[PDB]
Amino acid sequence: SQIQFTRHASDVLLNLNRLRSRDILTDVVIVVSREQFRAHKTVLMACSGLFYSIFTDQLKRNLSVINLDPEINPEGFNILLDFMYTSRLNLREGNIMAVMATAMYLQMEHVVDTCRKFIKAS
Amino acid sequence: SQIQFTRHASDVLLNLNRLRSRDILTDVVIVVSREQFRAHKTVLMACSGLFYSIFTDQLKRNLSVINLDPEINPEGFNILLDFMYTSRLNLREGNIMAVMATAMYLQMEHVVDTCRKFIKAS
Numbered sequence: 063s064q065i066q067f068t069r070h071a072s073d074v075l076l077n078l079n080r081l082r083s084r085d086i087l088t089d090v091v092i093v094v095s096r097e098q099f100r101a102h103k104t105v106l107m108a109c110s111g112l113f114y115s116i117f118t119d120q121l122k123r124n125l126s127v128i129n130l131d132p133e134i135n136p137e138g139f140n141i142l143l144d145f146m147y148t149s150r151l152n153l154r155e156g157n158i159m160a161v162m163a164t165a166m167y168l169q170m171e172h173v174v175d176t177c178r179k180f181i182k183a184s
Numbered sequence: 185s186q187i188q189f190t191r192h193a194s195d196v197l198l199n200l201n202r203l204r205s206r207d208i209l210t211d212v213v214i215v216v217s218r219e220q221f222r223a224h225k226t227v228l229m230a231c232s233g234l235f236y237s238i239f240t241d242q243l244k245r246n247l248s249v250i251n252l253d254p255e256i257n258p259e260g261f262n263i264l265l266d267f268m269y270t271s272r273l274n275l276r277e278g279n280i281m282a283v284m285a286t287a288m289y290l291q292m293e294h295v296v297d298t299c300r301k302f303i304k305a306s
């Protein structure tokens with residue numbers, strides 16, 4: 063059968079984060095109140111139920127700008143976008159509520175579950 | 185410090201392969217003689233020294249069609265494209281030479297090294 067490369071997926075994600083850092087082939091800007099964040103739609107869809115539901119629809123597939131809900135905390139979004147590209151989630155007592163509320167809105171079930179475990183273990 | 189999600193990178197790659205299977209946001213067609221393969225440029229760049237060198241150049245960044253070297257075996261390319269999206273490499277005695285020659289051309293150093301180990305262990 064097939065040879066499994068145990069570090070390939072992480073190596074791919076690291077290189078996709080390098081492309082995001084250099085703004086290479088980013089195709090969308092996410093507006094979160096006064097802040098803006100560029101990303102790859104494919105990565106957003108891969109991590110979020112919300113972005114999946116948006117860009118999978120042929121009507122919204124080619125949008126270059128997504129205006130998020132004005133109540134969404136930009137810091138919460140920033141932390142989650144970095145999570146999407148790194149597999150690392152920066153949860154603190156100062157940000158737990160903002161991050162969890164953002165993850166619920168973005169429909170990132172695994173992150174929501176982790177936020178629940180963080181509260182439980184606090 | 186940050187919470188590490190050990191399965192996140194693999195979950196992202198699986199979802200990117202699902203998008204490729206549905207032709208969602210694929211932005212390039214790779215022509216390999218009589219065969220054609222659609223892909224996401226970001227994933228190709230993330231896995232291959234060749235595609236990285238091509239699309240990182242502003243002159244070639246927006247190409248929608250890449251005509252590979254006519255001597256490249258389409259089966260070899262097909263196997264490697266599936267590798268890029270799955271972390272699984274299908275090496276057999278019948279394909280080892282074709283896969284290794286393709287990986288060398290695509291500048292996929294880790295795959296070339298694995299092909300060398302396959303020959304060594306044969």
Ligand SMILES: Cc1cc(C)n(-c2ncc(Cl)c(Nc3ccc4c(c3)CC(=O)N4)n2)n1
Nearest residue numbers: 107108109110111114169170171172199202
């Ligand atoms: C069989 C099958 C079913 C689905 C929904 N697939 C799927 N394909 C492709 C992508 Cl990009 C994707 N994204 C995605 C959707 C929803 C959610 C997340 C990511 C994280 C989360 O919490 N919810 N999901 N594949």
Ligand SMILES: Cc1cc(C)n(-c2ncc(Cl)c(Nc3ccc4c(c3)CC(=O)N4)n2)n1
Nearest residue numbers: 077080229230231232233236291292293294
């Ligand atoms: C610091 C630093 C240096 C580089 C070259 N970085 C980098 N950033 C982004 C991408 Cl997409 C990328 N791809 C890539 C390039 C070459 C090769 C492979 C993938 C596989 C292989 O065998 N060779 N490489 N980052």
